[PDB]
């Protein structure tokens, strides 16, 4: 379907968009006490794999799944909350603020770099077709 460069750069754009979405969702839920069921929000992470279609030669980036972080959930002593345990510590998400802003900046700069790569390739693509005519 897609040309190889198109597929690689478009996969890069989609992967960076997914990472930015995960960062934004984490930054929104930084102060959430409960979900829809009664469990604390867990910071999400996105794992980049190389989609090496040929044997070890090249390939874009794919995202296998969005994993839930395994870090000590923040404990805040609020015994009056219905979600407090026997000891009374309500669970707040493990979303760090600085890491998510850094992730947003890095995802934006990778997105823009891949955009520039596509823009650069495009002129050569259109100029290839003048070879025959």
């Amino acid at each position: 379907a897609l040309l190889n460069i198109f597929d690689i750069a478009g996969s890069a754009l989609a992967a960076q968009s997914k990472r930015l979405n995960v960062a934004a969702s984490n930054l929104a839920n930084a102060d959430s006490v409960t979900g829809p069921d009664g469990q604390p929000y867990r910071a999400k992470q996105v794992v980049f794999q190389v989609d090496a279609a040929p044997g070890q030669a090249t390939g874009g980036v794919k995202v296998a799944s969005v994993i839930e972080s395994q870090a000590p959930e923040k404990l805040v002593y609020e015994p009056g909350n219905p979600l407090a345990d026997a000891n009374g510590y309500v669970k707040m998400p493990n979303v760090d603020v600085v890491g998510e802003m850094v992730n947003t900046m890095s995802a934006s700069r990778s997105y823009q770099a891949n955009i520039e790569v596509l823009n650069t390739v495009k002129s050569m693509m259109l100029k290839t077709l003048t070879l025959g005519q």
């Binding site: 379907a1 897609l2 040309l3 190889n4 597929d7 040929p54 030669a57």
Partner: peptide, 13 residues
């Protein structure tokens, strides 16, 4: 060969 060209159709068929 091992590397497909940039202007080739997606290696993934």
């Amino acid at each position: 060969g091992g590397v497909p060209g940039a202007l080739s159709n997606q290696p993934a068929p």
